[PDB]
Structure 1
Amino acid sequence: PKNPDLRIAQLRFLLSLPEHRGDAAVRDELMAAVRDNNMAPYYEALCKSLDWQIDVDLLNKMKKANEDELKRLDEELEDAEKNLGESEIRDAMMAKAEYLCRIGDKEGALTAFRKTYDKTVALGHRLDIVFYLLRIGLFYMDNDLITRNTEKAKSLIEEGGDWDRRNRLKVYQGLYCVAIRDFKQAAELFLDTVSTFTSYELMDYKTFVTYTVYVSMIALERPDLREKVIKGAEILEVLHSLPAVRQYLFSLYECRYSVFFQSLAVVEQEMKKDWLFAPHYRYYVREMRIHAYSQLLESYRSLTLGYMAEAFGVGVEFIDQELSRFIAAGRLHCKIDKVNEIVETNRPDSKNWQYQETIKKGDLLLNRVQKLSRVINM
């Protein structure tokens, strides 16, 4: 009942926040609106796209007759038949809970989750309840209840399970890629990709390939990065499936900067068709741009921009103002020169950079110990 719901929230996001994209998102979601008994979560999709349409009262009396049939079913179960715990009562309650997720709002679903969570003495049922909160917590992008149930699963549930938790390993990184935490934690737990069948617990596999390959270049520069993205097997086949991504890695690895210039623009126009690309459109570009410059400025200390006019790409004055914005950013420890056409770098010798690392971590501790020292002593 919660299986075709990661595409719905994409189509709701695709129609809402851009206004130019409104041709096909109204065409198929309106088919998904009249289907699926989607009658609580559509008024934000209905008022912001169209005016009104009369299919509303028909599905309301159907979901009321379905609710009242399920209202009289489980009260007759509890009044005539007497069993507690995990029984015919229990899976009827989660059948009500899976009704309130697919059809109803979240407010009825959350108060039914907490009601049936204390009606559980096993662990797999409690694991499935926290699976239900974490699945709806990603559907409605709640950053509040994920601060609780993730801790409540890892500390009270995830100690008797045996490899029934890789799915929420994938869900936590999905929250980490959407929040900001896409530096080294996202690419670490995306290294193990052994799951091919897609289910309630797993997303689309093709988009999971694109997500695990866009992040595996920011955590590690080249400490044998070629072993884990090229010498792999299960990731190498699925990037062999896609022409652009296989072009994108080879352009970065064999340093074809002229077509890595093009392959980054094709990915970034594709980035708009996503449901979690918000801290990506302005941060993944400038990080990958400054990563391409950094490995290019390696192995050259007297580099000229007359060689940049054909090797990296084209143009002359664009690269000059591009490098000037990043040297003045604080990054890219190299100098630029105009009237001699020599981009002379001044990279440190693993001492003067290490000398900075003591003086930045030192005084940061020193301001901490004085501020400690003055709160005490009255």
Structure 2
Amino acid sequence: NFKEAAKLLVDSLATFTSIELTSYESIATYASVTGLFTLERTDLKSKVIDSPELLSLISTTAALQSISSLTISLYASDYASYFPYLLETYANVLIPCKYLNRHADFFVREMRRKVYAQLLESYKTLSLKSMASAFGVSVAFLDNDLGKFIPNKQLNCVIDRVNGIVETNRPDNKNAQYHLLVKQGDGLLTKLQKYGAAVRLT
């Protein structure tokens, strides 16, 4: 549950009591993890410019450095250097921490989705080769990664292979709202159906 963490941990930065709590450089590293994972471009961005505490501390341990680097690249739209930082976070942030070593693999998985989401937002189309050069990874390397996310359907794009383009058919209109709503409304029916039936019979 990193959503709950994210709201609690921003407060932790502003004011800190140190008794029975792990060293403060560690507390900054936990805040940056939750912010990147949970929040999207805009909220995330405003959060790490309006936190003086993170900025006055700069880098001071390897784990903090790898996390902070990732951050800048992500909202600033540099994808060349986004990818070394991904590898770096893995080694020095998740594995050493007790509470994120369970999430080692979960973390890399979700983070590739977000980066891609923001890119897809800004483009109608990309060419696979252009999208690969942006990362700094070869042509074949990219196709695998996209293809693990796409049938699960939280990337909401498709790839014309013959055209070499990647198309983005993610709705943000009225059609998108429709998908959300009707799914919840089936859930209301179902909840009433069962609890209904149980009370009529008894």
Global fold match (TM > 0.5): yes
Counterpart-to-counterpart distance in 1, 2:65 and 2:54: 14
Report if the CA contact (8 A) 2:125-2:166 is conserved: yes
1:294 is the counterpart of 2:117: yes
Q: Which has the higher contact order (CA 8 A, sep 6+)?
A: 2
Greater CA radius of gyration, 1 or 2?
Answer: 1
Give deviations 1:168-199, integer Å, cap 9, x for gaps. Answer: xxxxxxxxxxxxx11x211111112134563x
Picking from 120, 128, 131, the partner of 1:305 is 128
| Pairing 1:50-199 to 2, within 5 Å after superposition | 181-182=1-2, 184-192=3-11, 193-195=13-15, 198=18
Cα RMSD for the two superposed structures: 1.8
Q: Point out the structure with the larger helix share.
A: 2
1:276 matched to which residue of 2? 99
1:219 is the counterpart of 2:41: no
1:236 is the counterpart of 2:58: no
Counterpart-to-counterpart distance in 2, 1:291 and 1:248: 12
Counterpart-to-counterpart distance in 1, 2:188 and 2:179: 14
Equivalent AA in structure 1 for residue 135 of structure 2: F
Picking from 248, 261, 264, the partner of 2:83 is 261
Q: Structure 2: state its 5+ residue gaps.
A: none
Assess, with a 3 A threshold, how the Cα gap between structure 1 residues 213 and 322 changes in structure 2: closer, same or farther.
same
Name the TM-score, length of structure 2 as normaliser: 0.88
Name the TM-score, length of structure 1 as normaliser: 0.49
Give deviations 1:125-161, integer Å, cap 9, x for gaps. Answer: xxxxxxxxxxxxxxxxxxxxxxxxxxxxxxxxxxxxx
SS of the aligned residue for 1:273 comes to coil
How far did 1:302 drift? 1.7
SS of the aligned residue for 2:46 comes to helix
Assess, with a 3 A threshold, how the Cα gap between structure 1 residues 203 and 284 changes in structure 2: closer, same or farther.
same
How far did 1:375 drift? 0.9
Say how many residue pairs are matched.
196
Give deviations 1:340-359, integer Å, cap 9, x for gaps. Answer: 01111102133111101121
What percent of counterpart residues are identical? Answer: 40
Equivalent AA in structure 2 for residue 267 of structure 1: T
Counterpart-to-counterpart distance in 1, 2:130 and 2:108: 24
Equivalent AA in structure 2 for residue 260 of structure 1: Y
SS of the aligned residue for 1:348 comes to coil
